[PDB]
Design a protein around this ligand. Structure first.
Ligand SMILES: *C(#N)[C]1[C][C](F)[C]N1C(=O)[C]([N])[C]1[C][C][C][C][C]1
Ligand SMILES: *C(#N)[C]1[C][C](F)[C]N1C(=O)[C]([N])[C]1[C][C][C][C][C]1
Lengths: 825, 822
């Protein structure tokens, strides 16, 4: 009991600063391009985004893949010649900074780019502007880097979301001031295609734009999609180009004010923020045509809209999750969702279904009568559930060979795990009088399913979210994908035949988790892979073997791109009293002496769409947990029920009772860790997490005060009523439908249950947080004062939902160390 | 050793009960009205605003002053209600935005009726209540009631609040108000309403306003009104209103959070930061004609015959305005942007012509204005330090071609004193139809005489509601002042005819807040001392009518009477021989030889004196509570503080932060030697606003003196504070780079402590005076230097913690922070 309890060494504030300062002192976004020159030594050029160790910023790079190897390390050749993509002092525009928050982009420089393979044209944002360069194809392969040519513009403000036109690389598109524009890269000609935008709250219409809740909660960063092929309709031979697009009216969506980064100005910015229960934007898919002559001059432009309203045709639809087109350009498609997020629909939209917009009532019925009777929406798929629809990206339509459609689809709600299915929907025209107005039935456009074959199955998932995707080879009839079949703790690359659902073959080595990228030629892949114990590598594997059995191509290591007082944690697992396997992670105290009992930090997140505990390298993002361990803290992480990678039913334990299930699992994990490992002092446990983790830190202190001595709640969710529609309604329902659950899970309403003793609660929040508004902390403090309750608080004035600036970051870590040092006893 | 007194360490529940155990407005806004009835038993009815001990809200009250009182018994007057079971405070204490902000600008803590207007002959009372307007009739033609009457609400077609109600002096059938930043008028008898200005439309696109005091004018110049009734009618009959018209277009906007935290919205505010543009301003006139039936016939919008910017090129702020009692001239009190040059300017009504968009009509009216008519600059106060705005300006009626007036003047000698002045109004002759450029001293009247009525090393009180009363029969001016001592306000009287004997009418050993009968036969004094709680007594002025200067004030009757240990006032001299006054709370149940930990409670900015001889136990209960636990609490009025004249206050000029802490350290070291109980090893500095600023300056510049600092709502960056206050003491930023930087505590964060537990920051989130930005930007810079801090926010609080539950939490936190860390 006396000598048994390990006392942490108490440092001064400057001492802790030096400790934090001392502790702190990869290739992605790939494009495989084959070289058509047998006499040269290189088979491919691999293009990618990457940040070298010497460089400040992310940039466009390339490596040369050789034809024969005798351990190769590939050189990182620069593409742009001494180019600063990041603007002066890292100070982005408002639109571009907010895109970086919605995409969680910590890195400076070029973060997306667009590529067109045949022409070899690269298109990207840089310097709060647009830029381009040419390599490969007709332009040829460069040895030395080339300066990227800036694209001139008559538009004022930022040009967001550049995309090259697939049908014609002379053309490209962008968003300027919430409208769709198009332009000619060769001639410099620009043309505006939508006219939704003009002042501020007085200007609620926008076009080609994903709104806040769509970006943040549905992972869609665009609301326009190029048609992939061109028509040649007209009198005298003009070429037509199309863009499907989301139109938005935000009139009835509540406004909130968030402070500007320019603190000296003392202003806010206005923002359409749909809180749970309140109105989301009024939405529509519209179509935009434009014609071109043989000289590349944009002749005419047209605004088209659906022949009947979007709200009449699709009466139950609340959000457009995803959209695009078939590869031949025959149909546009969309992925729709109801407001509960328990009913999804994959809908085809023929171009003939769209007619020109006019304000005149006479003209619209003429164009409506001119639409063929056979033309209509075709609902090819319908996913339904008692839990919720997670949006899965995978939807690969095969080109038709009319009257049916074959496609691959990721589906979780059928069995409870996300799996690939091949589906044939039967397209049969009911015949519709589009001029006379129209009320659809409950299954109005629902295609019959001819067959639905399961390609994958089991107690494991195909990855289809947060950038995971399939690669489909139509020669060999194989679908390449990623998944958890080996284990929840490791991502792995698999291959399976979509023709014949037989043997799934694993192509990545076990004991590591893999983030993979395929050649469109299917001859080689990259895997950026890692483990808990080993830092990440990036290797190039060539798929080799006889062409008579392409399923069993043995992956042979070709070459490498990246290689290589930190002590890794140990994964463990355990069963709850209800027989549910939970995984956990422990960092042991460094230089441990058995028999000692050490104070413990329960690091938590615990919300949906995150798995903390898996077999990949943690020392980059979670260095602070190792730093804690270097001082003699036990650090424990538990993936409780709710967390992702374990299918729908595991996730679904949260449904309408957020806060209620999670802490019990965390307590069980903490008590398991106590019995297994001999070094936890349960008298000195601290709970700590950001966002949902801060919410859970507060729930731990409220419901389990004898378990947790202190709480360091970062950016916490204190009032579920103040969070958005998309996230909150999905897990917790609308507020009027779940009064008991909203109240029970709102930490601000249970402040009487928070401690009478001071030094047991530290709150942290970013002042500029536009995700979880500082209100949450403000309102928690308001209620803490009303109940007569002590608290400590730290603001980060130049910081949103994450602490990006290093000096702020170091200060955060020093404070945490001091709070634990002085008060965790 | 055993000598160091250690405070008893309580749990948080313990400190909460301590604070709750400790905590478990007087008659003001007086009107004397004589009873015109020899047979009846009462000489006067005294009307006033007041709040009984049982009652929640402030309300309109009266007492009956009897004709004879028994001199054996001490007679206590009854507080009779005017209104019959009336709630003046709106539902849940939730005022409108305009009305809540007026209560912040006035520091009005109390709920209910905070102002009212009275008309004496008719007996009409007019006042805001229930976010609406109300009236009742008593005295005069209406007669004197015994029991209370229900106040009649005034119906209106206006939407939103009706601000700033005033009865027309010339005709009590009429009254005025502000609705949506424009002047309106209405007839109380007939219910007819008429709008007179059209500056506001239907708030960034809509910058013009009429009849409105802007933010900096309310907050920094003590003017809460932008329109002034003419006191007489010309003859149908015309009635007049002088008004300030205002354009806020070029004034920067800032966003402050709304009280509705759930909304997560802000409110826009024209906030002129130091160096940036103040409003473009103007005096205009609004006339309206009435028939014998009380119908408003016609209305006219009038403007000065030449522009305001051409006539008065150097004038930046309109400090005050009004009219002469006969209605002959309007007048205004002007100021330059440095605030070192003031002008009292008379403005004849004939100088104003109808506004028209037609140039031909404007030149018709412009040619028609007489050549002899003009502005008359009757006074000019100028200084190297700054012009404090003094209210006192009494124009005598003209017994033409000259003007006698009384004027309070501080810049002449360095102390504020009464002078009788005769200006000669001689008409220079002006071609008003052609435009022209005034130079310096263009309209400067010659001074015939300027006689000093008062003089000495002491001040006449003329700010923050202080005023004179002038009796014209007896040729006496009654006033208030510090002639006896800086620590006590006292009532004096002196002849404006013959500048001779100043006679004191209030008893020494107390500080007095007085109000005179306009009949000069009796006064009220609301008075107190450091040792004794406040009383409100009625004194009758008695004696021979041939010698009115020596009327002996005899106590007539009383209105208000009354583990607290009062502090002890002291004084001492600096190394430079400047007398500073100070206050100490000794530790309760002191054992001499013990050395106790100490709280230096500080304010230290301009326009405040903390240390005087009046009761502190109401407003500074927390300082006694500190003392009850064994803290020494020391308060020092350093150089810069008010009540000491201009040169003492002027020690601040262009070096805020630099002089004040030295005087605080000197006072603290003096207190150490004199009183045997200060442990200088355990000294904390604590203050709000300027005090928080100084608490931070104490920690920066004297870290070996002060162990901890509890900075409340601090001024951390002088560049972020307003024009009116900052430019006056610290100049423009372009003119004082060295001083702005030296006095900005946010820029010297490297000098703040490396050790944690030495700095507690506190701030109201809804503070629209000292924006939360100040704390925010201090924290931002604390992070950049790698410096520890603790922080507390008040989410439902502006510049003051008004809500009691917030207040208790604030006090508990302070006790815990001191207990653990001092
Ligand atoms: C945090 N984290 C906040 C508040 C609430 F807990 C959810 N949340 C989010 O950031 C979500 N928008 C993210 C959804 C995508 C994957 C991570 C969480
Ligand atoms: C505080 N107090 C704030 C900041 C600074 F100290 C000045 N200040 C004020 O509120 C002033 N505008 C007041 C003027 C009238 C008398 C008291 C100070």
């Amino acid at each position: 009991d006396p000598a048994a309890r390990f006392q942490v060494q108490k440092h001064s504030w400057d001492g802790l600063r030096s400790i934090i300062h001392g502790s702190r002192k990869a290739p992605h976004d790939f494009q495989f391009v084959q070289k058509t020159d047998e006499s040269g030594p290189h088979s491919h050029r691999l293009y990618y985004l990457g940040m070298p160790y010497g460089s400040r910023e992310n940039s466009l790079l390339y490596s040369e893949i050789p034809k024969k190897v005798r351990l190769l390390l590939l050189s990182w050749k620069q593409m742009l010649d001494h180019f600063q993509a990041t603007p002066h002092h890292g100070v982005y525009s408002r639109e571009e900074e907010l895109l970086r928050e919605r995409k969680r982009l910590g890195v400076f420089g070029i973060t997306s780019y667009d590529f067109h393979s045949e022409s070899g044209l690269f298109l990207f944002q840089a310097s709060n502007s647009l830029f381009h360069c040419r390599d490969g194809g007709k332009n040829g392969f460069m040895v030395s880097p080339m300066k990227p040519l800036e694209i001139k513009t008559q538009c004022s403000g930022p040009r967001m979301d550049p995309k090259i036109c697939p049908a014609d690389p002379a053309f490209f598109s962008f968003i300027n001031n919430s409208d769709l524009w198009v332009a000619n890269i060769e001639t410099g000609e620009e043309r505006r295609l939508t006219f939704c935008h003009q002042n501020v709250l007085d200007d609620p219409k926008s076009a080609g734009v994903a709104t806040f809740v769509i970006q943040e909660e549905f992972d869609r960063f665009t609301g326009y999609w190029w048609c992939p092929t061109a028509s040649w309709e007209g009198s005298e031979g003009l070429k037509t180009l199309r863009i499907l697009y989301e139109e938005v009216d935000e009139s009835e969506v509540e406004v909130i004010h968030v402070p500007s980064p320019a603190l000296e100005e003392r202003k806010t910015d206005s923002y359409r923020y749909p809180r749970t229960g309140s109105k989301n934007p009024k939405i529509a898919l519209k179509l935009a045509e434009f014609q071109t002559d043989s000289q590349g001059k944009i002749v005419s432009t047209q605004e088209k809209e659906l022949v009947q309203p979007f709200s009449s045709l699709f009466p139950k639809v609340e959000y457009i999750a995803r959209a695009g087109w078939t590869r031949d350009g025959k149909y546009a498609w969309a992925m729709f969702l109801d407001r509960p997020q328990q009913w999804l629909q994959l809908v085809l939209l023929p171009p003939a279904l769209f007619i020109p917009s006019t304000e005149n009532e006479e003209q619209r019925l003429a164009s409506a009568r001119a639409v063929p009777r056979n033309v209509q929406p075709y609902v090819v798929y319908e996913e339904v559930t008692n839990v919720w629809i997670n949006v899965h990206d995978i939807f690969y339509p095969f080109p038709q060979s009319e009257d049916e459609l074959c496609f691959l689809r990721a589906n979780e709600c059928k069995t409870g795990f996300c799996h690939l299915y091949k589906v044939t929907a039967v397209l049969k025209s009911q015949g519709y009088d589009w001029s006379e107005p129209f009320s659809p039935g409950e299954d109005e456009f629902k295609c019959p399913i001819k067959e639905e074959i399961a390609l994958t199955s089991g107690e494991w998932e195909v990855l289809a979210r947060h950038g995971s995707k399939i690669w489909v080879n139509e020669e060999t009839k194989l679908v390449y994908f990623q998944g958890t079949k080996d284990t929840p703790l490791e991502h792995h690359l698999y291959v399976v035949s979509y023709e014949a659902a037989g043997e799934i073959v694993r192509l990545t080595t076990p004991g590591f988790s893999h983030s993979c990228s395929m050649s469109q030629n299917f001859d080689m892949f990259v895997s950026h892979y890692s483990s808990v114990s080993t830092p990440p590598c990036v290797h190039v594997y060539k798929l080799s073997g006889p062409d008579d059995d392409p399923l069993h191509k043995q992956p042979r290591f070709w070459a490498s791109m990246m290689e290589a007082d930190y002590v890794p944690p140990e994964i463990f697992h355990f069963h709850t009293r209800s027989d549910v396997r939970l995984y956990g992670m422990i960092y042991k105290p460094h230089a441990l002496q058995p028999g000692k009992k050490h104070p413990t930090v329960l690091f938590v997140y615990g919300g949906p769409q995150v798995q903390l505990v898996n077999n990949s390298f943690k020392g980059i993002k979670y260095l602070r947990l190792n730093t804690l361990a270097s001082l003699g803290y036990a650090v424990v992480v538990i993936d409780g029920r709710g967390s992702c990678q374990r299918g729908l039913r595991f996730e679904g334990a949260l449904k309408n009772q957020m806060g209620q299930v999670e802490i019990e699992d965390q307590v069980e994990g903490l008590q398991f860790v106590a019995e297994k490992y001999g070094f936890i002092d349960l008298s000195r446990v601290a709970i700590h997490g950001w966002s949902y983790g801060g919410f859970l830190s507060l729930m731990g202190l409220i419901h389990k005060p004898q378990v947790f001595k202190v709480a360091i709640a970062g950016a916490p969710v204190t009032v579920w009523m103040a969070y958005d529609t998309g996230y909150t309604e999905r897990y917790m329902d609308v507020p009027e439908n779940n009064q008991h659950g909203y109240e029970a899970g709102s930490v601000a309403l249970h402040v009487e249950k928070l401690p009478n003793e001071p030094n047991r609660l530290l709150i942290l929040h970013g002042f500029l947080d536009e995700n979880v508004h500082f209100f949450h902390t403000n309102f928690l403090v308001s209620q803490l004062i009303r109940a007569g309750k002590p608290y400590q608080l730290q603001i980060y004035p130049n910081e949103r939902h994450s602490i990006r600036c290093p000096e702020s970051g170091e200060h955060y870590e020093v404070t945490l160390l001091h709070f634990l040092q002085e008060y965790l006893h």
